[PDB]
Amino acid sequence: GSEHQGALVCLAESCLTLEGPCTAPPVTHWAASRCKATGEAVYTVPSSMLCIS
Amino acid sequence: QYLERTPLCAILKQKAPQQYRIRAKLRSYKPRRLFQSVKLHCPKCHLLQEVPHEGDLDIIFQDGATKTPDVKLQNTSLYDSKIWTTKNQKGRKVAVHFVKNNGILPLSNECLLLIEGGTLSEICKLSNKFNSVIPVRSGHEDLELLDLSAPFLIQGTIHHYGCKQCSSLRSIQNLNSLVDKTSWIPSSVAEALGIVPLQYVFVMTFTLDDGTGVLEAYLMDSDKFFQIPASEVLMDDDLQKSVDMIMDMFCPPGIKIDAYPWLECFIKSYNVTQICYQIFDTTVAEDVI
Ligand SMILES: [Zn+2]
């Protein structure tokens, strides 16, 4: 029925931000450290150095 | 009964490939910035890739928000569609498509959403209330995946990515081919869309020292070593703290190697074409909590 559909539409709408200023979301501490460390060298190993199976 | 440990000086004098049970202290490790350990690995082409940053994803999703959802692609036998208008967002319009199972919408926790014009924040909130989210755009004849640079499926805290090289991208109607529309197995979703899924792995380089020798050994695994899924860690603050504390336990900054605990593990040697080493069949998490 449409009333179950209606419920899902309301649940969807509750997750959206359709008005006002789109504020910045609260982020985890690795992602915060990641944002700060932009520009610096990125640790990297070529896949040929690793043993994959 | 027969637990014996091979000294590192012995291992360094031997030819590869072989396997060794060792005990050594973690003198040092890379990466120093632990978030850089989380890599994406294609099982098909064996390429290693960086996980896109928030900023990278924000660009993609904002760019998606400039495009107007096509009314022709709304309300099919596969999904019901709803369009929200906005205010003070450059005239943005968000389309959410609710995927049906046999012409019926399932419960929210079994219901897959396809979204046009949503932000990363909105997508992540939707992923809490619903089974999963695919970011999509209005193609010429069908809905299509927004961009393989962004996740092809967000499910729980897991942002699933696909290999750009190996994938042959198919349009959204191909989700009809899935056995049900309530389980939403990531690999099944990927196959339906012609996507080869990337695998999350912790990649680190350990410098091991047992006082007889020194050796560089790689870590490459998804969930065995830490008993923390690499697929969840970047979106879970508690799992990040656990990885921090485990690395801080084995190799605490400042203090001397004399005080570090011992790491019990297996390592396999192998020939690159020089001999490299890699940890296997090892978890620190079974005896530490
Ligand atoms: Zn690939």
Numbering used by the authors:
A (entry chain B): 264 to 316
B (entry chain A): 341 to 613, 619 to 634
The authors write:
We crystallized the POT1C–TPP1PBM complex and determined its structure by single-wavelength anomalous dispersion (SAD) at a resolution of 2.1 Å. The TPP1PBM polypeptide forms an extended structure that wraps around the surface of POT1C. Although primary sequence analysis failed to identify any known protein motif in POT1C, the crystal structure reveals a typical OB-fold architecture comprising a highly curved five-stranded β-barrel at one end of POT1C. The crystal structure also reveals a second domain at the other end of POT1C (residues 393–538), which adopts a compact, globular fold featuring a central curved seven-stranded β-sheet surrounded by four α helices. An unbiased search for structurally homologous proteins using Dali42 revealed unequivocal structural resemblance of POT1393–538 with archaeal Holliday junction resolvase Hjc. Notably, there is a zinc ion between the OB fold and the HJRL domain of POT1, which is coordinated by four cysteine residues contributed by both POT1OB3 and POT1HJRL. This zinc ion helps stabilize the relative orientation between POT1OB3 and POT1HJRL. Consistently, Dali search revealed that the structure of POT1OB3 is most similar to that of the C-terminal OB (OB3) fold of TEBPα2742. Four hydrophobic residues in helix H1 of TPP1PBM, Leu271, Ala275, Leu279 and Leu281 make intimate interactions to the POT1 groove. Taken together, we conclude that although all three binding modules contribute to the POT1-TPP1 interaction, the first module is essential for the binding.
